[PDB]
C-alpha cells in the first residue's frame, strides 16, 4: 500500500540552511531580488525522507536496522516540469518498488513521487539493504513500472508474430496494423517462491498506436498471467523486437571534464539537522562501534549532494535547471576529515542530453562513489544558411564517413536520376560545364513528362500567362542540354538543392549522434528556411524536399526576361550603412531607396534586412542599382553629417536636393549600354551571378504555380504541430509559429491570400 | 643615459668607483639633437630612489 | 612566433611588425660592420 | 570567547559548520579544517585580527613591557581595511589583566562584520568558462575584489565608468581601496569585475614586447590586473544592508569605544583625521570605514614619523 | 480545439507561409530579436557551409544586447557547423668536452624549485609575476634569490620574460654557481638519501661512468634539484639510477 507524507512548505530559511550544509554555492539558490530563489533536486530527500524511510519499517519487512546499508539514491525530473521554487507546496507519494531475498540479505527499492499543485515533478529512487539471512519469501514481491516500448510495424511477418501472442488483446480484432507505430505503457506485478523461481508473473498495461494527428489512442490491452515462471516474457519480447523512446549513443572517446577535491566535514551534525537523517551511526561513537563500523561515518546523502554540486558547477555551467537525472552508487563508507578525489567524464548523449559519469576516490585510492547524470544542452537555436557560398565537393568529406549522411544524399540522388535524369552528386563532385538529359525509353518518357508539367506566371503587358519552362521540350524532344560558362554548380537550380542537402545531411548526422534538443527553436535565411523544416519537423521527405528546392531555383531563373544571353536587366547589391557615414542608419536607406524608385519609376527595394547598420541587400532594376551605388558614393565623399542638416537645417528640402543628387546620377546611368555591367563603390558590393530580384514585389505574380506545387509535395499528414509550435520562426512572419487568429491576421496584412481570409471569416471551426 | 637600462649601467659604474664623482646628465626625448623616445619625467620617477643611494652621483637634468 | 600566432586569426599586430622591421635596420648595420 | 559567541548569537552554528576549536587545529595538524572554508569571511576576519593581536603580544613580552607601556611609546596608530578595529583596541590597553577585555573586542566587531556581511552578500559559484579564461589570462581566481597596479586613480575611473554605463544599479563596481598613487583595488560582483577585465586586456601590452623603439604617448600601457584571494567586497555599496545590523549587534553584546579610554590618536581611514574628535559613537564610524566608505590610504598615511611597525599579516607581502 | 482540425489548420497555415515567404521580405531583425530576447537563447548553432548567420547573430549582440546579456548574467555561445565542429560534435583533440653552465638553464631551475613545479611545466617566454599566483612574497623571494645568485638585476625584472631576462645575466655571468644555487644543492644531497656518499663522491660517479667534467657536472645536479624525489629512497644502487635519469 502507498505511503503519503505531509505536504511540505519550502521556505527561504530551509534552502539557505541546506546549501551551506552540503556546500552548494550555485547562484540559483541565493536570495537576489526579482528572479525568485530555486531549491536544489538534492533537497527532495528533506521532503521525501518522512515517506521514503517509512517503507522499510513494517513487521513483514523484518530487519536489523543497525546493519542497514544505503546502497543507491537516484533523482529523475519528469520531462517538462520546472525544478523546486522557494514558494512551492510539495505533496510526497512513496511507492515501494522491490522487496527481494538474496543469499547475503534483503534489498528494498523505494520510489518517491514529489507533487507540486497535483503534477508529478521528480522520482526519488532509493535502494536499501538489510544484512542477514531471511526465509521471508511470502512477504517478497516486485511491482515495477517498466519504461514505454515502441514498435515500428513494417512487414506482414511483424503483425503475424503479435497475433500469435495470447497477451496481444485488441479491442477491434480486424484492425489494420500495417505501417503503424505501437507504444506499450507497461507495468508488471511479480510474487516469488524461491531466490530464482517466481510464484506469479502478471504483466498488463494499455496498447496505444501513434496516429497521424500527433496524439495516440488506446485500443489494446496487455493481459499476461502465469504461475511458476523464470522470467518476464513480454518485456524480453519488447527489448529485442521494439525499442525505448530514447536511445543512448556513446561518444567515440570519453572526455575528462575535471578532477576535483571535495572534503568531508569534521562532524556530521549540521547535515543531520537540515536532512532529518538523525541516524546515530553518523554522530554518536558508541552507536557506531555497535554496528562494527570504523567509527562515526559521513552521511551517504551528504556525499551524493556534495559531488552533484560540482557536476552542477562543471557540466551545467552554474545552472540548476539543466541537470535532469542524477543517480549515485555507494561502494564504500566515508570518514570525516577525508579528501575525496572525484573524476568527471562526459561519456554520451541521449536526444540532446549529455551523459556525465563520475568516480570518487579517497586518499587510499579506493572506489567510493560512482553514478550517472543526465544534463541538458544550453537553450539552442539552429539557423540554416542561405545562397551564395558553394564550392566543388562541399560536405563530401561528411558523405564518406557518416552513415546518416550516406542515407540523405543517395536517397535524393536516386530520385534525381529516377525523375529529372541526373546525378546531383556528379554535379557537386565534378562540377561539369555542359550536361545533356536524354528522354529515350519508357523511363526516359516519364522524366520528359516531368520536365513538361513545370509552369510559372509572369505579367506580359496585359495579364497573367501560364507559360511553361523549357519551351524547347515537347513530345518529340530527345535531348535537353544545361549550359553554363564556369560550371552547373553555380546556376542556382543546382546550387539550391546541393546547399539544402549538405545542411540536412549535417543535421541527420547530429540527430544520429543525439546532439539535438527537443525544445530547440529554428529559423533559416532565404533557402535554409526549407532545410530547417525538413530537419526539425520532418515536413517533407528528402524525396519531396529537393523537388521543391529544384523547382524554386527554376521559377527564380525565368520570372525575369533575360533575352540577350545569360544576362537580364535585374540584379542585387549588398550595402554596409556604416561604411558611407558613422550616422547613416536604417531610416536613411528606407528614404534613399524608396525615393530612387518613386523618382525614376524603376523598381528597386530592400530584400535582405540582415545586420543592423552593417549588412543590407537591395534588389531591382540594374539602371536603378547604378543610381543607388552612386548616390551612396556621393554621401561618402561629401561626408555632410546627416543628423546635423536632416530636419535641423533644411526641412524637407532634402526631397528637393536628394532629387537634384538623384537626377545627375539617374540621367547619367540611363544612357549606358543596355545590359549594364555593375561596378562596386565604397559601400554597395554587387552579388556576382545574381540576376533576379527575389523577395521583391515583382515576383508576387508567379506564386500560384509555386503554391500549387508545394500542395503536391507537402501532404497534411506530414506536418507535426507540436514540433513547430513556438520553435519555428519563418522569414515572412518573424514571430514564433503559432496556430492563432492574430498570426493568420498578421500574414494576410502582408500577403492578400484568399485561402487565409476564408479561415479568418469563419474562425468558428473550434467546433469540428 | 637615454633609457631606464642605461641609468642602471651608470649606477653600476658609480658602485665600481664610489670615491669618483659622476655627473648623471639626464635627457628626455624633448631635447635638441640626437634624442631618445623617453618622456622626461617617467624614468626619473622610477630610478631617482636607486640613483640617490650612491652619493658620488651628481644628478643633472636637461632637455628643454 | 607572435606574428604567426596572430596572423592565424588588427590592433597590436602593426606594433609587432615595426618591432621586427626595426631589428632588420640594426641587423643590417651588424653584417655591414662584419 | 568565539565558541561562546556561537551559542550567544541566534544563527551562528550553521555558518560555523566545522566549529572554532583553533586549539586542536594547531596542536594537532591532522584535525585542521580545509583551506577553502578558513578563507570564508565569518571565520577569516576575526582570526586575522587574532594574528595581529598575537604579533603585538610577542612584541610586548620580549621587551618585558606591559601593553600599556608599548602603546605609550607609539605617537600614533591606524589600520588597513579590518586592522583599524585592532588599532583602536591597542589604544585602549593598560595592563596584562585589562588586556583580555580589549581582546574580547578584537573580536563582537570582526566576528559580526564577518557574519553579517556574509549574510548581506555571500560569494557564489562562477561559470568555469569564465574561471578557466581568467587563469590563462593570468588574472587571479575570480573574487569580489580586483587589484589594479600601475594605473593613476584617473585612468582606473575612466575604465570603470565604461563598465558601469552597461550595468544596472545593484551590480555596478566602484574604486574601493586607493593603496598607492598607482596601486588601486576595485570591488563589486566577480561577474562584473570579469567584464572590467575584458576592457583592460584591450589597452594592455603583451609582456614580451620591448617597447624601446616606440614614441612614449603611442606606447601600450604595461600593467598588472588580478583578483585578490578574498570572499567579500569590502568598502562597497553591496554591504550597506549589513551596516545597520552590526551596530545593533554591538549594543546587545555590551561593546562600544569611547574617546577618553583611547590614549593615542587613531587615524580615520577615509578622512585621515583623529577618531577621538567625533560627537557620535566611535564603533558606528569604524563599521562604515570598513563596510561602505572607501580607503584613501595616501591621505590616511598623512602623519610625519621616523618609524612604522607593520604587525599586519603577510610579512614581506604585508601592508608595511 | 480538436487535434484533427488543429492539424488541418497548421497544414494550411504553413503551406501559404512557405508560398508567400517566397514573395515577401525576410524580417530577420524580428527573427533575431525573438530567439535572442523572447527565449533567451544560450547557444545558436549555424548549420551551413559558411558562418554567414553566425556573423549576423554575433554583431547583433555587439550592437544592442550589451546592456541586456550582462543584466541576466547570460553567457552566449555562437557556433557554425563547418568551423566549430568539435564543440558541437563534442570531440576535442587530446592536447666529452667541458662547457660552463648556461644562465638560461640556471635561471629556469631557480624558478622551478621555488614554485615546487617540474622542469617543463615552466615555459621560458613568461614574466616572473605571470607564473607566480601574484603571492608577491613568492614573487620577491624569487627576486631575492636572483639578487644572491647573479648579483646585479635589471629594473622591474618581474615584468620581462625569463627567456628575455636570461641573456641579460648571460653577459656578466660565467660558470661559477655562487651563493644560492650551491646552498640548494647543499640541501638536495644532505636532506635526501645519498645516505653515505656526499657531494665529492656523487661528483666522481658522473665523471667516471658518464665522463662529465666540472661544468657538465653542475648542470646535471641542477636538473636533479628541479626533479627532487622527496620519498625516503633506500640505498646507493637506487640513488645511482636517480643520477642516471637526470644525466
Short mmCIF file of C-alpha atoms in Angstrom, two decimals, chain A residues 31-441:
data_model
loop_
_atom_site.label_atom_id
_atom_site.label_comp_id
_atom_site.label_asym_id
_atom_site.label_seq_id
_atom_site.Cartn_x
_atom_site.Cartn_y
_atom_site.Cartn_z
CA UNK A 31 18.07 35.50 -2.34
CA UNK A 32 18.90 38.00 -5.12
CA UNK A 33 15.77 40.20 -5.55
CA UNK A 34 13.46 39.78 -8.64
CA UNK A 35 14.35 36.33 -10.00
CA UNK A 36 12.95 34.17 -7.13
CA UNK A 37 15.06 31.57 -5.18
CA UNK A 38 15.28 27.96 -6.56
CA UNK A 39 15.58 24.77 -4.43
CA UNK A 40 18.06 22.01 -5.44
CA UNK A 41 16.98 18.49 -6.59
CA UNK A 42 19.16 17.22 -3.63
CA UNK A 43 16.60 18.98 -1.30
CA UNK A 44 13.87 16.45 -2.36
CA UNK A 45 15.32 13.96 0.26
CA UNK A 46 14.47 16.50 3.05
CA UNK A 47 10.85 16.49 1.65
CA UNK A 48 10.85 12.74 0.80
CA UNK A 49 12.52 11.29 3.95
CA UNK A 50 9.35 11.06 6.17
CA UNK A 51 7.56 8.97 3.45
CA UNK A 52 10.52 7.11 1.83
CA UNK A 53 12.19 5.74 5.03
CA UNK A 54 8.74 4.51 6.26
CA UNK A 55 8.81 1.78 3.53
CA UNK A 56 11.49 -0.33 5.37
CA UNK A 57 9.63 -0.24 8.76
CA UNK A 58 6.68 -2.77 8.60
CA UNK A 59 6.60 -6.14 10.52
CA UNK A 60 6.56 -8.17 7.21
CA UNK A 61 9.93 -6.47 6.29
CA UNK A 62 11.83 -7.60 9.46
CA UNK A 63 15.49 -6.37 9.57
CA UNK A 64 18.32 -5.35 11.96
CA UNK A 65 18.13 -1.62 11.06
CA UNK A 66 21.61 -1.17 12.71
CA UNK A 67 23.14 -3.21 9.81
CA UNK A 68 21.18 -1.32 7.09
CA UNK A 69 23.38 -0.12 4.16
CA UNK A 70 22.26 2.82 1.96
CA UNK A 71 23.17 1.30 -1.49
CA UNK A 72 21.99 3.85 -4.15
CA UNK A 73 19.87 7.05 -4.37
CA UNK A 74 18.60 8.38 -7.73
CA UNK A 75 16.69 11.55 -8.74
CA UNK A 76 14.75 11.79 -12.05
CA UNK A 77 12.97 15.05 -13.07
CA UNK A 78 9.87 14.08 -15.17
CA UNK A 79 10.07 15.74 -18.64
CA UNK A 80 8.57 19.28 -18.86
CA UNK A 81 8.20 20.26 -15.14
CA UNK A 82 10.44 23.04 -13.64
CA UNK A 83 12.62 22.32 -10.54
CA UNK A 84 11.57 23.34 -6.98
CA UNK A 85 10.94 27.10 -6.39
CA UNK A 86 11.10 28.66 -2.85
CA UNK A 87 7.28 29.30 -2.72
CA UNK A 88 6.23 25.71 -3.65
CA UNK A 89 3.92 23.42 -1.59
CA UNK A 90 5.11 19.81 -2.25
CA UNK A 91 2.98 16.62 -1.79
CA UNK A 92 5.11 13.42 -1.30
CA UNK A 93 3.97 9.94 -2.56
CA UNK A 94 6.31 6.97 -1.76
CA UNK A 95 5.69 3.57 -3.50
CA UNK A 96 7.99 0.56 -2.68
CA UNK A 97 9.28 -0.98 -5.99
CA UNK A 98 11.09 -4.24 -5.00
CA UNK A 99 11.48 -6.38 -1.85
CA UNK A 100 13.79 -9.32 -2.81
CA UNK A 101 15.50 -12.05 -0.70
CA UNK A 102 19.14 -12.67 -1.85
CA UNK A 103 21.59 -15.02 -0.01
CA UNK A 104 23.57 -12.09 1.60
CA UNK A 105 20.34 -10.28 2.74
CA UNK A 106 17.18 -8.37 1.66
CA UNK A 107 17.13 -5.45 -0.86
CA UNK A 108 14.36 -2.79 -0.59
CA UNK A 109 13.77 -0.42 -3.56
CA UNK A 110 11.64 2.74 -2.86
CA UNK A 111 10.17 5.17 -5.49
CA UNK A 112 9.17 8.63 -4.13
CA UNK A 113 6.88 10.89 -6.25
CA UNK A 114 7.04 14.64 -5.33
CA UNK A 115 3.82 16.55 -6.36
CA UNK A 116 3.56 20.36 -6.98
CA UNK A 117 -0.08 21.62 -7.45
CA UNK A 118 -1.09 17.97 -8.27
CA UNK A 119 1.55 17.49 -11.06
CA UNK A 120 4.38 14.93 -10.67
CA UNK A 121 7.78 16.78 -10.50
CA UNK A 122 10.57 14.20 -9.85
CA UNK A 123 11.08 10.50 -8.93
CA UNK A 124 13.36 9.73 -5.91
CA UNK A 125 14.70 6.13 -6.26
CA UNK A 126 16.42 4.67 -3.13
CA UNK A 127 17.81 1.10 -2.69
CA UNK A 128 18.26 -0.22 0.91
CA UNK A 129 19.99 -3.41 2.16
CA UNK A 130 19.21 -5.37 5.38
CA UNK A 131 22.22 -7.68 6.01
CA UNK A 132 21.32 -11.19 7.27
CA UNK A 133 19.61 -14.48 6.30
CA UNK A 134 15.83 -14.27 5.54
CA UNK A 135 13.38 -17.10 4.55
CA UNK A 136 10.67 -14.38 4.09
CA UNK A 137 9.52 -15.45 0.55
CA UNK A 138 5.76 -14.92 1.33
CA UNK A 139 6.31 -11.16 2.10
CA UNK A 140 8.55 -10.69 -1.02
CA UNK A 141 7.41 -9.06 -4.32
CA UNK A 142 8.42 -6.94 -7.36
CA UNK A 143 5.87 -4.31 -8.54
CA UNK A 144 7.93 -2.31 -11.13
CA UNK A 145 6.77 0.33 -13.70
CA UNK A 146 8.55 -0.70 -16.96
CA UNK A 147 9.53 2.15 -19.35
CA UNK A 148 7.49 2.70 -22.57
CA UNK A 149 8.41 0.39 -25.53
CA UNK A 150 7.59 1.38 -29.18
CA UNK A 151 7.48 -0.99 -32.23
CA UNK A 152 7.61 0.16 -35.90
CA UNK A 153 5.43 -2.38 -37.86
CA UNK A 154 6.93 -2.64 -41.42
CA UNK A 155 6.33 -6.24 -42.68
CA UNK A 156 3.46 -8.80 -42.94
CA UNK A 157 5.51 -11.05 -40.53
CA UNK A 158 5.71 -8.45 -37.66
CA UNK A 159 1.84 -8.47 -37.49
CA UNK A 160 1.61 -12.34 -37.66
CA UNK A 161 4.05 -12.63 -34.64
CA UNK A 162 1.89 -10.27 -32.49
CA UNK A 163 -1.32 -12.26 -33.44
CA UNK A 164 0.37 -15.48 -32.10
CA UNK A 165 0.74 -13.82 -28.60
CA UNK A 166 -2.19 -14.50 -26.15
CA UNK A 167 -1.42 -11.21 -24.26
CA UNK A 168 -1.89 -9.15 -27.51
CA UNK A 169 -5.64 -8.46 -26.86
CA UNK A 170 -7.02 -5.81 -29.31
CA UNK A 171 -10.44 -4.09 -28.94
CA UNK A 172 -11.06 -4.36 -32.74
CA UNK A 173 -9.74 -7.81 -33.95
CA UNK A 174 -9.81 -6.84 -37.71
CA UNK A 175 -7.76 -3.61 -37.08
CA UNK A 176 -5.08 -2.84 -39.76
CA UNK A 177 -1.61 -2.81 -38.04
CA UNK A 178 0.35 -2.21 -41.32
CA UNK A 179 2.80 0.80 -41.39
CA UNK A 180 1.65 1.87 -37.86
CA UNK A 181 3.67 2.60 -34.64
CA UNK A 182 2.51 0.84 -31.40
CA UNK A 183 3.57 2.31 -27.99
CA UNK A 184 3.35 -0.04 -24.92
CA UNK A 185 2.82 1.57 -21.44
CA UNK A 186 3.66 -1.49 -19.26
CA UNK A 187 3.84 -2.23 -15.51
CA UNK A 188 4.32 -5.77 -14.03
CA UNK A 189 3.48 -7.46 -10.65
CA UNK A 190 5.75 -10.38 -9.58
CA UNK A 191 5.49 -12.56 -6.42
CA UNK A 192 8.29 -15.06 -5.54
CA UNK A 193 8.56 -18.72 -4.46
CA UNK A 194 12.42 -19.11 -4.34
CA UNK A 195 15.50 -16.84 -4.87
CA UNK A 196 15.19 -17.65 -8.66
CA UNK A 197 11.66 -19.08 -9.44
CA UNK A 198 8.70 -16.58 -9.48
CA UNK A 199 5.36 -17.81 -7.97
CA UNK A 200 3.15 -15.38 -10.04
CA UNK A 201 4.14 -13.30 -13.13
CA UNK A 202 1.49 -10.64 -14.00
CA UNK A 203 2.14 -8.13 -16.86
CA UNK A 204 -0.51 -5.64 -18.10
CA UNK A 205 -0.97 -2.05 -19.36
CA UNK A 206 -2.57 -0.24 -22.33
CA UNK A 207 -1.50 -0.54 -26.04
CA UNK A 208 -1.58 2.87 -27.83
CA UNK A 209 -0.87 3.30 -31.59
CA UNK A 210 0.72 6.54 -32.98
CA UNK A 211 -1.93 8.31 -35.17
CA UNK A 212 -1.15 10.81 -37.98
CA UNK A 213 -2.85 13.53 -35.79
CA UNK A 214 0.13 13.52 -33.27
CA UNK A 215 -1.99 12.28 -30.26
CA UNK A 216 -2.28 8.49 -29.58
CA UNK A 217 -5.44 6.46 -28.65
CA UNK A 218 -5.62 3.23 -26.53
CA UNK A 219 -7.25 0.28 -28.44
CA UNK A 220 -5.20 -2.61 -26.92
CA UNK A 221 -4.60 -4.31 -23.52
CA UNK A 222 -1.62 -6.48 -22.41
CA UNK A 223 -3.03 -9.36 -20.22
CA UNK A 224 -0.25 -11.85 -19.28
CA UNK A 225 -0.87 -14.02 -16.15
CA UNK A 226 1.25 -17.15 -15.32
CA UNK A 227 2.16 -19.49 -12.41
CA UNK A 228 5.67 -20.89 -11.63
CA UNK A 229 7.81 -18.92 -14.20
CA UNK A 230 11.56 -17.93 -14.52
CA UNK A 231 11.45 -14.60 -16.48
CA UNK A 232 9.11 -11.87 -17.87
CA UNK A 233 8.31 -12.99 -21.47
CA UNK A 234 6.51 -9.74 -22.52
CA UNK A 235 9.41 -7.35 -21.63
CA UNK A 236 12.17 -9.52 -23.29
CA UNK A 237 9.93 -9.55 -26.44
CA UNK A 238 9.81 -5.69 -26.48
CA UNK A 239 13.60 -5.34 -25.78
CA UNK A 240 14.62 -7.29 -28.96
CA UNK A 241 11.69 -6.53 -31.37
CA UNK A 242 10.83 -2.93 -30.31
CA UNK A 243 12.99 -0.12 -28.79
CA UNK A 244 12.84 2.53 -25.97
CA UNK A 245 11.61 6.09 -26.81
CA UNK A 246 15.14 7.42 -26.04
CA UNK A 247 18.39 5.84 -27.46
CA UNK A 248 21.71 6.45 -25.59
CA UNK A 249 24.69 6.96 -28.01
CA UNK A 250 28.27 6.73 -26.60
CA UNK A 251 30.99 9.17 -27.83
CA UNK A 252 34.00 7.70 -29.74
CA UNK A 253 36.29 8.92 -26.88
CA UNK A 254 35.14 9.85 -23.32
CA UNK A 255 36.25 13.40 -22.22
CA UNK A 256 37.74 14.08 -18.74
CA UNK A 257 35.84 17.31 -17.74
CA UNK A 258 37.74 17.90 -14.43
CA UNK A 259 39.34 16.12 -11.40
CA UNK A 260 38.20 17.89 -8.18
CA UNK A 261 38.87 17.76 -4.39
CA UNK A 262 35.66 17.85 -2.24
CA UNK A 263 36.39 17.21 1.51
CA UNK A 264 34.11 15.69 4.24
CA UNK A 265 33.35 17.94 7.27
CA UNK A 266 34.80 17.46 10.83
CA UNK A 267 31.29 16.45 12.16
CA UNK A 268 28.05 15.05 10.60
CA UNK A 269 25.86 17.19 12.99
CA UNK A 270 24.97 20.05 10.56
CA UNK A 271 23.62 17.71 7.77
CA UNK A 272 21.61 15.59 10.31
CA UNK A 273 19.82 18.85 11.41
CA UNK A 274 18.55 20.01 7.95
CA UNK A 275 18.05 16.49 6.39
CA UNK A 276 16.10 14.66 9.16
CA UNK A 277 18.62 11.75 8.81
CA UNK A 278 19.37 11.78 12.61
CA UNK A 279 20.82 8.19 12.24
CA UNK A 280 23.05 7.72 15.34
CA UNK A 281 25.86 5.80 13.47
CA UNK A 282 26.83 9.16 11.77
CA UNK A 283 27.04 11.22 15.04
CA UNK A 284 27.49 9.09 18.27
CA UNK A 285 30.71 6.97 18.55
CA UNK A 286 29.29 4.23 20.88
CA UNK A 287 26.35 3.57 18.43
CA UNK A 288 28.87 3.43 15.51
CA UNK A 289 31.10 0.87 17.38
CA UNK A 290 27.99 -1.36 17.99
CA UNK A 291 27.40 -1.60 14.16
CA UNK A 292 31.05 -2.90 13.71
CA UNK A 293 31.86 0.35 11.76
CA UNK A 294 35.32 2.05 11.78
CA UNK A 295 33.74 4.99 13.75
CA UNK A 296 31.18 7.80 13.08
CA UNK A 297 30.87 7.81 9.23
CA UNK A 298 29.88 10.74 6.93
CA UNK A 299 26.23 10.54 5.65
CA UNK A 300 25.62 8.75 2.33
CA UNK A 301 23.22 11.54 1.23
CA UNK A 302 25.82 14.27 2.12
CA UNK A 303 28.38 12.73 -0.30
CA UNK A 304 25.69 12.45 -3.11
CA UNK A 305 24.77 16.17 -2.82
CA UNK A 306 28.45 17.37 -2.47
CA UNK A 307 29.55 15.64 -5.76
CA UNK A 308 26.27 16.70 -7.50
CA UNK A 309 27.14 20.38 -6.64
CA UNK A 310 30.40 20.02 -8.68
CA UNK A 311 28.52 18.16 -11.51
CA UNK A 312 26.10 21.18 -11.45
CA UNK A 313 29.10 23.61 -11.47
CA UNK A 314 31.43 21.95 -14.05
CA UNK A 315 28.92 20.46 -16.61
CA UNK A 316 25.79 22.73 -16.36
CA UNK A 317 27.93 25.98 -16.14
CA UNK A 318 26.42 27.11 -12.74
CA UNK A 319 22.72 26.38 -13.69
CA UNK A 320 20.29 24.18 -11.62
CA UNK A 321 17.67 23.78 -14.44
CA UNK A 322 19.90 21.81 -16.91
CA UNK A 323 20.61 18.77 -14.63
CA UNK A 324 17.68 16.38 -15.35
CA UNK A 325 18.53 12.97 -13.72
CA UNK A 326 21.16 12.17 -11.02
CA UNK A 327 21.87 8.67 -9.55
CA UNK A 328 24.66 7.81 -7.04
CA UNK A 329 26.10 4.31 -6.22
CA UNK A 330 27.60 3.95 -2.66
CA UNK A 331 30.55 1.48 -2.86
CA UNK A 332 32.35 2.05 0.50
CA UNK A 333 31.88 4.33 3.55
CA UNK A 334 33.48 7.77 4.23
CA UNK A 335 35.12 9.13 7.45
CA UNK A 336 35.10 12.81 8.50
CA UNK A 337 38.17 14.97 7.52
CA UNK A 338 38.78 12.76 4.38
CA UNK A 339 39.96 14.17 0.98
CA UNK A 340 37.65 12.80 -1.80
CA UNK A 341 39.08 12.88 -5.37
CA UNK A 342 36.11 12.87 -7.85
CA UNK A 343 36.87 12.48 -11.63
CA UNK A 344 34.08 13.68 -14.02
CA UNK A 345 33.67 12.32 -17.60
CA UNK A 346 31.27 13.38 -20.42
CA UNK A 347 30.66 9.91 -21.99
CA UNK A 348 27.48 10.07 -24.16
CA UNK A 349 24.31 11.80 -25.42
CA UNK A 350 20.57 10.95 -25.41
CA UNK A 351 18.47 13.16 -27.79
CA UNK A 352 20.36 16.39 -26.85
CA UNK A 353 21.12 15.47 -23.18
CA UNK A 354 24.76 14.92 -22.02
CA UNK A 355 25.71 11.70 -20.12
CA UNK A 356 28.05 12.56 -17.19
CA UNK A 357 29.75 9.55 -15.47
CA UNK A 358 31.76 10.33 -12.27
CA UNK A 359 34.05 8.29 -9.96
CA UNK A 360 35.10 9.47 -6.43
CA UNK A 361 38.16 8.03 -4.58
CA UNK A 362 39.66 8.78 -1.09
CA UNK A 363 43.38 9.21 -0.07
CA UNK A 364 43.93 5.38 -0.20
CA UNK A 365 42.77 5.38 -3.91
CA UNK A 366 39.67 3.19 -3.10
CA UNK A 367 36.41 3.49 -5.16
CA UNK A 368 33.70 5.25 -3.00
CA UNK A 369 31.12 6.90 -5.36
CA UNK A 370 30.06 6.17 -8.96
CA UNK A 371 26.89 7.35 -10.76
CA UNK A 372 25.28 8.91 -13.87
CA UNK A 373 23.96 12.45 -14.56
CA UNK A 374 21.60 13.43 -17.44
CA UNK A 375 22.34 17.16 -18.15
CA UNK A 376 20.53 19.35 -20.75
CA UNK A 377 22.27 21.23 -23.58
CA UNK A 378 22.02 25.04 -23.12
CA UNK A 379 18.98 26.77 -24.80
CA UNK A 380 19.66 26.05 -28.51
CA UNK A 381 18.67 27.76 -31.82
CA UNK A 382 19.58 26.15 -35.20
CA UNK A 383 19.90 28.75 -38.04
CA UNK A 384 20.33 27.44 -41.64
CA UNK A 385 22.48 29.39 -44.19
CA UNK A 386 21.02 30.76 -47.50
CA UNK A 387 22.53 31.02 -51.03
CA UNK A 388 25.98 32.30 -52.08
CA UNK A 389 28.64 30.00 -50.53
CA UNK A 390 29.05 26.86 -52.74
CA UNK A 391 32.37 25.09 -53.69
CA UNK A 392 33.16 21.82 -55.59
CA UNK A 393 32.65 18.81 -53.23
CA UNK A 394 31.10 20.79 -50.31
CA UNK A 395 30.29 18.36 -47.40
CA UNK A 396 31.63 15.36 -49.42
CA UNK A 397 34.15 14.80 -46.53
CA UNK A 398 31.00 14.23 -44.37
CA UNK A 399 29.39 11.91 -47.04
CA UNK A 400 32.38 9.46 -46.88
CA UNK A 401 32.25 9.00 -43.03
CA UNK A 402 28.66 9.45 -41.68
CA UNK A 403 26.09 6.62 -42.27
CA UNK A 404 23.30 9.25 -41.75
CA UNK A 405 24.88 11.48 -44.48
CA UNK A 406 25.05 8.46 -46.91
CA UNK A 407 21.24 7.99 -46.35
CA UNK A 408 20.40 11.66 -47.22
CA UNK A 409 22.49 12.22 -50.40
CA UNK A 410 21.90 8.76 -52.03
CA UNK A 411 18.07 8.71 -51.46
CA UNK A 412 17.90 12.23 -53.02
CA UNK A 413 20.38 11.26 -55.81
CA UNK A 414 18.25 8.11 -56.60
CA UNK A 415 15.21 10.47 -57.01
CA UNK A 416 17.12 12.97 -59.26
CA UNK A 417 18.06 10.05 -61.61
CA UNK A 418 14.54 8.44 -61.49
CA UNK A 419 12.59 11.76 -62.04
CA UNK A 420 14.86 14.51 -63.58
CA UNK A 421 17.54 12.14 -65.03
CA UNK A 422 20.85 13.43 -63.50
CA UNK A 423 23.16 12.64 -60.51
CA UNK A 424 23.17 15.64 -58.08
CA UNK A 425 26.37 14.01 -56.65
CA UNK A 426 28.06 14.15 -60.13
CA UNK A 427 27.12 17.90 -60.17
CA UNK A 428 28.66 18.53 -56.68
CA UNK A 429 31.80 16.30 -57.10
CA UNK A 430 32.82 17.07 -60.76
CA UNK A 431 31.05 20.46 -61.48
CA UNK A 432 30.71 19.90 -65.27
CA UNK A 433 30.15 22.73 -67.83
CA UNK A 434 27.54 21.04 -70.12
CA UNK A 435 25.03 18.33 -69.01
CA UNK A 436 22.67 16.62 -71.53
CA UNK A 437 19.38 14.99 -70.29
CA UNK A 438 18.05 12.22 -72.65
CA UNK A 439 14.36 11.08 -72.81
CA UNK A 440 14.84 7.70 -74.61
CA UNK A 441 12.96 4.60 -73.33
#
